[PDB]
Amino acid sequence: ASNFEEFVLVDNGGTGDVKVAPSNFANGVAEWISSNSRSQAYKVTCSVRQSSANNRKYTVKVEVPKVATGVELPVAAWRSYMNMELTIPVFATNDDCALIVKALQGTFKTGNPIATAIAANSGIY
Amino acid sequence: ASNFEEFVLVDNGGTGDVKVAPSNFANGVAEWISSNSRSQAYKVTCSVRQSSANNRKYTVKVEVPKVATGVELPVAAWRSYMNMELTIPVFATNDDCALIVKALQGTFKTGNPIATAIAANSGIY
Amino acid sequence: ASNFEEFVLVDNGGTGDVKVAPSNFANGVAEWISSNSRSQAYKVTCSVRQSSANNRKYTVKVEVPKVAWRSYMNMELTIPVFATNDDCALIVKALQGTFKTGNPIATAIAANSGIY
Amino acid sequence: ASNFEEFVLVDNGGTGDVKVAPSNFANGVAEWISSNSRSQAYKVTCSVRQSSANNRKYTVKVEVPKVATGVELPVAAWRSYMNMELTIPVFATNDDCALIVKALQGTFKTGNPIATAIAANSGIY
Amino acid sequence: ASNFEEFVLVDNGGTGDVKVAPSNFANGVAEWISSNSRSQAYKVTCSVRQSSANNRKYTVKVEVPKVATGVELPVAAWRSYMNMELTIPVFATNDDCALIVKALQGTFKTGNPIATAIAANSGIY
Amino acid sequence: ASNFEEFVLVDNGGTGDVKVAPSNFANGVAEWISSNSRSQAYKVTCSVRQSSANNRKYTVKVEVPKVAWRSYMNMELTIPVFATNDDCALIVKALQGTFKTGNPIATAIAANSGIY
């Protein structure tokens, strides 16, 4: 098998979906790039290295770009950078990992605080 | 209104769901804590500060604990720490933010690489 | 849940009760007051914060006025990290205890007296 | 004619109430404890002094212990400390006091926020 | 039970009102903004502190922006800053306040001098 | 035009209205007061002046008394030089907005409360 597949990063449901594909596997660093001009593409990198003698540490970066218009030459007016470090003890059962994943999914699920916050250029209140 | 509500962090659907609640709003730092012994609770913090003259920077931390057994005194055998920094230009329309959010949701949606990776104590392949 | 709600600070039965209400949440610090002038209002503030990496501190303050001045209450409740929900319940009951009408402390304060 | 009597500090119906009794009054600090060993006992101390020429300060402290199970030697795993300083102006009439008391009672009556929160390891929100 | 809701800051009938919503409450300063980008948004901040032992200070600030036409990148050409410090003695009753409010309202009601002048780039004469 | 005129500071309907009137113009600083003792008068002062070579500053102050003391309002409105008349109109509406009855700030102050 393989998990280094292509996948949908932005899900607008069949329409303007943003599929991102494998760019290259550098040094334990997976890279995904949406099609079209690299100059204006979403990017998602991920890599797991072993930190403490007791910890693995995933590192996921995400780059969302704003398609800049009125330049003729494709470029991004700007990009927002997501950048996270997940640490997980060696002692985690595959079952535990699942949990962890959910938690993430959770913090970001639409409707939830953090999620709604970001989506409104708003902090907490 | 208010977005500093209580919410489900782990969604097992009505059953063993992990609800986390507002602990306290420190210095622009929202804190959520699952009920029961703080010694063994999930924690989610979040805070937005203005970085560059052009950037806002959310910082979300998540702590998933492993309920340690055979101690009599509640404690965690260990905790996995999620920790992310999201940066977003001032120029983002509320519409843009939405997008960004999706992207996150995406990277972590079940079935997708990153997601499936973590959930298997596995890297990329 | 949601705790921030109007509640009765003084249970005078059903007539003259002192209901106190949400008034400010500045700095995740809950404030409640009576429907009076700030001068003549009952005030209740309450806030949690993890002090030691071993204990949490609830900090409650209640101000009581006298009309025709006010007395201050200031409590610091330290609760170890290990307290189960059930454990805390206990703790509460205890406060409840120390202050229930008819009990030394209660009766003491109420008579403007010390312990004899 | 004393007011320094034993009283139940933890009303549990009738089955296992934690009753507390006068133990010491040295240094003008009333002390009450439980029928347990000094190390495992609940403790309540109260005291009054005339701070300003206009006020009096009742100072009460309640120590709640968590009986450590499994050590043989009676002792507490940890203790929850309670500390209150009640400032009451001289001008107060007896009724005025009773009032304060009532309010005090109210503040922590079961079902009311403050009480509720403490009891669920959560902040007020 | 909040009082921190969105509200219309610029009543334009129904066709193009500038509505403003809660965005942040960090540091005890209520903030409300517009659905525009952070850079082009109207902003309203309010705060209260007990200055003297006899007074309270409401501090409100309104930022009004002039959407810059023709740059592509959303941004303000300039901003009109509004800054008020409302000192209200403790002894005030609720009605007393409402009054202040009324007066405040009056001061700037359309058709009344102060308002008129600002609105015609003239001094009072 | 001519702005300096008697106006209603407090619209209490039609009975008990607080009309305020021109009282002093010392230093091109407009003053208005109620028909009461200076102690018990409503006061409104207002003055413009070009601060930065880029902005103008209207400076309004309103004093409100309590009879049987007074609370002060102090506003500084900075308006860039480029504001068209229409632009300013907007600005005004905004103040109007921030303070209209039923709106957070308004309602907040009115309840002698903060934001919750």
CA of A122 vs chain E CAs: smallest distance (Å): 4
Nearest-Cα residue of chain A relative to residue E33: A122
Which backbone phi and psi does B37 adopt, to 5 degrees? -30, 115
C-alpha distances in Å from residue A66, one per residue of A61, B93, B100:
17, 10, 10
**How does DSSP assign E74-116, residue by residue?**
--EEEEEEEEEEEEEETT--HHHHHHHHHHHHHHH-TTSHHHH
Of E27, E92, E94, the CB nearest to C35: E94
- Domain E1-125: which topology? MS2 Viral Coat Protein (3.30.380)
Q: Which of B47, B29, E40, E118 minimizes the C-alpha distance to F91? A: E118
SS3 state at C55 = strand
d(CA B93, CA F89): 26
Q: Which of E37, E88, E97 minimizes the C-alpha distance to E58? A: E88
- Backbone region of residue F91 per phi and psi (left: phi > 0; alpha: psi in -120 to 50; beta: other values): alpha
Kindly state the tokens that stand for E99: 């009054």
Q: Which of A7, B116, D64, F70 minimizes the C-alpha distance to C55? A: D64
The residues that bridge with E30 in the sheet, in sequence order, are E46
Nearest-Cα residue of chain A relative to residue E70: A70
d(CA A59, CA F106): 48
Cβ pairs bridging A and B (under 8 Å): 235
Kindly state the tokens that stand for C11: 């249970």
d(CA D67, CA C4): 33
CA of D90 vs chain C CAs: smallest distance (Å): 9
Of A12, A62, A124, the CB nearest to B30: A124
Residue length of chain C? 116
**One-letter identity of residue D91:** F
CA of D99 vs chain B CAs: smallest distance (Å): 31
CATH number for C1-116: choose from 3.40.50.300, 2.40.50.140, 1.10.10.10, 3.30.380.10: 3.30.380.10
d(CA F6, CA E75): 41
Which backbone phi and psi does E116 adopt, to 5 degrees? -45, -55
Element (H, E) at B76: strand B76-89
- Which chain E residues touch F109 with a CB distance below 8 Å? 58, 86, 88, 97, 100-101
Kindly list the domain boundaries of chain C, sorted by start residue: 1-116
Cβ-defined contact of B2 to E2 (cutoff 8 Å):
yes
Angle between helices A94-108 and B94-108 (to 10 degrees): 170
d(CA B24, CA C29): 8
Contact present, E55 and E48 (Cβ < 8 Å): no
- Which chain B residues touch C83 with a CB distance below 8 Å? 37-38
Of C6, C21, C37, the CB nearest to E91: C37
What does the angle CA F109 – CA D106 – CA E55 come to, to the nearest 5 degrees?
25
Burial A42-77 (b: 16+ CB within 10 A, else e): bbbbbbbeeeeeebbbbbbbbbbbbebeeeeeeebb
Contacts 24+ apart (CB under 8 A), D76-79: D76/D39, D76/D40, D77/B73, D77/C82, D78/C54, D78/C80, D78/C82, D79/C80
Resolution of the determined structure in angstroms stands at 3.5
d(CA C12, CA F56): 57
d(CA B82, CA B118): 12
Contact present, E38 and E3 (Cβ < 8 Å): no
Contacting chains of D (3 CB pairs or more, <8 Å) are B, C
CA of B120 vs chain D CAs: smallest distance (Å): 33
d(CA A105, CA A113): 13
The answer for residues whose C-beta is within 8 angstroms of residue D16's C-beta and 6 or more apart is none
d(CA F110, CA E76): 33
**How does DSSP assign D81-106, residue by residue?**
EEEEEEEEETT--HHHHHHHHHHHHH
Of B1, B4, B90, the CB nearest to E38: B90
Contact present, C79 and C61 (Cβ < 8 Å): no
